[PDB]
Amino acid sequence: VNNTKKWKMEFDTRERWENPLMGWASTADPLSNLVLTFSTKEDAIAFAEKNGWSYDVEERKVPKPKSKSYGANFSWNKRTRVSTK
Amino acid sequence: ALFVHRDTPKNNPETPFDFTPENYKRIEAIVKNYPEGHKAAAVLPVLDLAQRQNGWLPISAMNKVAEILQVPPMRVYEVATFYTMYNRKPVGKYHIQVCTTTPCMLRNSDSILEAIQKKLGIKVGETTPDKLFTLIEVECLGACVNAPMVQINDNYYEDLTPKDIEEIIDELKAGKIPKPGPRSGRFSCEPAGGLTSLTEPPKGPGFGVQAGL
Amino acid sequence: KTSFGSLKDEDRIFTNLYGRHDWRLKGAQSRGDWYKTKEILLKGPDWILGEVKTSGLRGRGGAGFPTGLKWSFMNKPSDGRPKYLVVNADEGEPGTCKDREIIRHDPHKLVEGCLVGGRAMGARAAYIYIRGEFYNEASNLQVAIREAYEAGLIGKNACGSGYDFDVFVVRGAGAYICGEETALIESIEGKQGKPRLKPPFPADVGVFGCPTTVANVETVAVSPTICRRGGAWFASFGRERNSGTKLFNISGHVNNPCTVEEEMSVPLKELIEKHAGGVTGGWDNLLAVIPGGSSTPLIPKSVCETVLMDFDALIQAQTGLGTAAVIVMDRSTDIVKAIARLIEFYKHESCGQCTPCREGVDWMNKVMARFVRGDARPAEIDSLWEISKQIEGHTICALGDGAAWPVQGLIRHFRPELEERMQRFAQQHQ
Ligand SMILES: NC(=O)C1=CN([C@@H]2O[C@H](COP(=O)(O)OP(=O)(O)OC[C@H]3O[C@@H](n4cnc5c(N)ncnc54)[C@H](O)[C@@H]3O)[C@@H](O)[C@H]2O)C=CC1
Numbered sequence: 158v159n160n161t162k163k164w165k166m167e168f169d170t171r172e173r174w175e176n177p178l179m180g181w182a183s184t185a186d187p188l189s190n191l192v193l194t195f196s197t198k199e200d201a202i203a204f205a206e207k208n209g210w211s212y213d214v215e216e217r218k219v220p221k222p223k224s225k226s227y228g229a230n231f232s233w234n235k236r237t238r239v240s241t242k
Numbered sequence: 243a244l245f246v247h248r249d250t251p252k253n254n255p256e257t258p259f260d261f262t263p264e265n266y267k268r269i270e271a272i273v274k275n276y277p278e279g280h281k282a283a284a285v286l287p288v289l290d291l292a293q294r295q296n297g298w299l300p301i302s303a304m305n306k307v308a309e310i311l312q313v314p315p316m317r318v319y320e321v322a323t324f325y326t327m328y329n330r331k332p333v334g335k336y337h338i339q340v341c342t343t344t345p346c347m348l349r350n351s352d353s354i355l356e357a358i359q360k361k362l363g364i365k366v367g368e369t370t371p372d373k374l375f376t377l378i379e380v381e382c383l384g385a386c387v388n389a390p391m392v393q394i395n396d397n398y399y400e401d402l403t404p405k406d407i408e409e410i411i412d413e414l415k416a417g418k419i420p421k422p423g424p425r426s427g428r429f430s431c432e433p434a435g436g437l438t439s440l441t442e443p444p445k446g447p448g449f450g451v452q453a454g455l
Numbered sequence: 456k457t458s459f460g461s462l463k464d465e466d467r468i469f470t471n472l473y474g475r476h477d478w479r480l481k482g483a484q485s486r487g488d489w490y491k492t493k494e495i496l497l498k499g500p501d502w503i504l505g506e507v508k509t510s511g512l513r514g515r516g517g518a519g520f521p522t523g524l525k526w527s528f529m530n531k532p533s534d535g536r537p538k539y540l541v542v543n544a545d546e547g548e549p550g551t552c553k554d555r556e557i558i559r560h561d562p563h564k565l566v567e568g569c570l571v572g573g574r575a576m577g578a579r580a581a582y583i584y585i586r587g588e589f590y591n592e593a594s595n596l597q598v599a600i601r602e603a604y605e606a607g608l609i610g611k612n613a614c615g616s617g618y619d620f621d622v623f624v625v626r627g628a629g630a631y632i633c634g635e636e637t638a639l640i641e642s643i644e645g646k647q648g649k650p651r652l653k654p655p656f657p658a659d660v661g662v663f664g665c666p667t668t669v670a671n672v673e674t675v676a677v678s679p680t681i682c683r684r685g686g687a688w689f690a691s692f693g694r695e696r697n698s699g700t701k702l703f704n705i706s707g708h709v710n711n712p713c714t715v716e717e718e719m720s721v722p723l724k725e726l727i728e729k730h731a732g733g734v735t736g737g738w739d740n741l742l743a744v745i746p747g748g749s750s751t752p753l754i755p756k757s758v759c760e761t762v763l764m765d766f767d768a769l770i771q772a773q774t775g776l777g778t779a780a781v782i783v784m785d786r787s788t789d790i791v792k793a794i795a796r797l798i799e800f801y802k803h804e805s806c807g808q809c810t811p812c813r814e815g816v817d818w819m820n821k822v823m824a825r826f827v828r829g830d831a832r833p834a835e836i837d838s839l840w841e842i843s844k845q846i847e848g849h850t851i852c853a854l855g856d857g858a859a860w861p862v863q864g865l866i867r868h869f870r871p872e873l874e875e876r877m878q879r880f881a882q883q884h885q
Pocket residue numbers: 514515516517518519520525528545546547548551634636656657658669750751775776777778852853857
């Protein structure tokens with residue numbers, strides 16, 4: 158989960174077409190490889206507003222806390238018994 | 243030796259296996275030893291009953307045990323491949339198991355293994371062509387003071403010399419059954435030169451019972 | 456008391472150890488079994504736990520956990536779930552055949568122990584997980600259990616005490632790891648014998664999810680004798696924290712390979728030279744002794760002169776007491792072949808669940824198979840030492856410990872012999 162720590166700013170992907178000679182992926186978008194890295198969301202929004210970029214923001218998705226019990230795998234009367242191990 | 247299965251004409255899910263009706267009564271008695279809701283605990287005794295009926299387990303005994311206990315068939319396949327008594331291959335009528343761990347190797351179990359090999363003409367893992375004997379080489383059978391020893395399907399034949407195990411295989415070839423015990427002078431596990439202990443008569447009831455009881 | 460051993464026949468718990476008397480109910484009652492069992496059941500669980508805690512009885516399975524402290528973990532009110540005694544009767548340890556003799560020749564002592572132990576812990580029934588290879592022993596135990604049900608000694612209103620207690624026998628199917636208590640619990644549940652992690656302990660979540668005690672045959676069968684004779688009688692033997700009598704299995708290179716009951720802190724030399732007829736070729740023919748079964752590290756001949764056969768003296772000899780199954784090895788033994796066969800046992804008896812045992816025990820077997828031939832170089836002894844240390848303590852159960860320990864004992868006491876094996880391989884093959 159170490160790549161999920163920082164806020165990124167990317168852009169909309171524009172056209173990538175085929176090179177007539179070699180079949181390579183040609184582009185005309187200069188900002189197609191431009192990915193920035195921010196410590197917080199607010200730094201990212203301030204940088205986007207400072208540069209006049211229209212932005213939209215997804216909130217951070219953290220995994221919810223789970224109730225892990227190794228004893229639940231061997232219960233007396235619950236469906237959460239494992240059939241094998 | 244393989245822990246995957248392939249369908250052969252002798253071993254496939256259309257191979258005919260079914261329990262006998264008295265085996266169904268014994269399965270009912272097995273299942274009534276476990277709590278309601280944990281009928282899956284009867285997988286090992288019912289699969290052992292299927293092996294004692296059929297001699298080995300085709301993959302129709304595993305599926306029948308999976309059906310009559312309402313467990314998934316993979317959870318019977320796991321048990322049949324985990325434990326070394328379940329014969330997934332058809333073994334001979336006398337499945338000889340020579341113990342060759344360290345307490346039996348120290349008392350020359352290699353002599354008995356070589357004697358069984360040159361007596362039957364087979365090696366470890368092979369079956370005689372008349373399907374009477376299968377020789378394998380097992381771990382500790384828990385008869386270490388009676389080393390060296392073998393096991394022939396249920397019975398421990400103990401304190402053996404190569405002459406003893408050749409006599410046992412001879413009178414198994416004659417249709418008879420030998421006596422499951424030590425082949426020396428002693429009876430179960432005592433010292434061979436007489437008892438070093440328990441020579442006095444036992445004290446009976448009430449000896450040394452404390453006060454307040 | 457300073458000198459231990461020479462146990463008299465009046466203090467033998469396991470009379471009819473050798474099959475010389477009747478094992479059935481009329482013979483067991485005529486030797487003292489099932490005597491005043493109703494009174495023991497009516498005196499309550501706390502009294503039986505106090506008699507086991509007073510006796511200094513440690514767990515005869517091989518780990519030596521205190522039996523009364525262990526059984527008091529079940530002394531708690533019910534939470535809707537039933538409670539169970541589970542009697543460990545697998546005994547797959549090479550060297551060890553004592554539980555076979557208890558089940559086969561004193562079965563009613565084991566059944567009365569099931570009743571008394573399961574009374575002390577409030578247990579509903581007893582599941583004796585016997586080894587599958589002990590088929591005649593299991594039927595022997597079933598005949599005794601039928602005789603105990605028919606006499607009213609177990610079952611509905613057991614011994615007339617109003618405490619209902621069943622006794623079941625579950626047979627194994629050829630897995631040494633199914634004597635490990637959580638793997639045995641999983642094997643009763645119809646699954647692969649793979650050890651559960653700890654915690655949950657079996658007193659919290661054991662067989663079927665219920666509160667459970669897994670106890671050895673020998674620590675169960677001595678408990679009616681402890682509750683009849685008193686805990687102080689049983690604590691009068693052995694050293695302190697090392698009380699009682701112990702069954703010993705002297706096998707290997709001795710004159711008279713035997714099973715014998717002896718006092719706890721008996722010397723090893725006294726046991727071998729008294730009950731086994733001594734080592735073949737004399738005491739000077741002794742090379743090394745595996746003291747208590749295959750899981751314990753061996754001790755060389757210099758340690759065997761003075762060491763006592765209890766838990767603490769063998770821990771001070773940097774081995775363990777274990778199952779108290781004495782494997783004696785003389786000077787005519789290739790000890791590297793014997794320890795490598797022991798590690799070959801431990802990789803054939805390994806369930807494959809966790810990574811250190813599944814991988815490292817096979818890798819220790821390959822290194823030890825090269826060490827028998829000497830197809831190695833002496834940096835690989837320290838390599839195998841570190842591999843044993845990586846397996847030890849990092850596994851789920853103690854079969855990883857029990858596989859790492861004989862390698863460590865072999866290295867620790869016979870590194871020069873391993874080195875000369877490898878250098879004669881190196882000189883005659885190059
Ligand atoms: N008797 C035989 O045939 C064999 C015996 N062994 C012996 O097994 C031993 C290893 O067995 P283990 O059970 O893994 O050893 P040990 O660490 O776990 O514990 C022994 C007993 O104490 C109980 N216990 C310990 N701490 C506890 C706690 N905090 N709460 C509740 N219960 C607790 C365990 O449940 C177990 O029943 C080895 O020393 C070896 O000598 C090994 C192989 C075969």
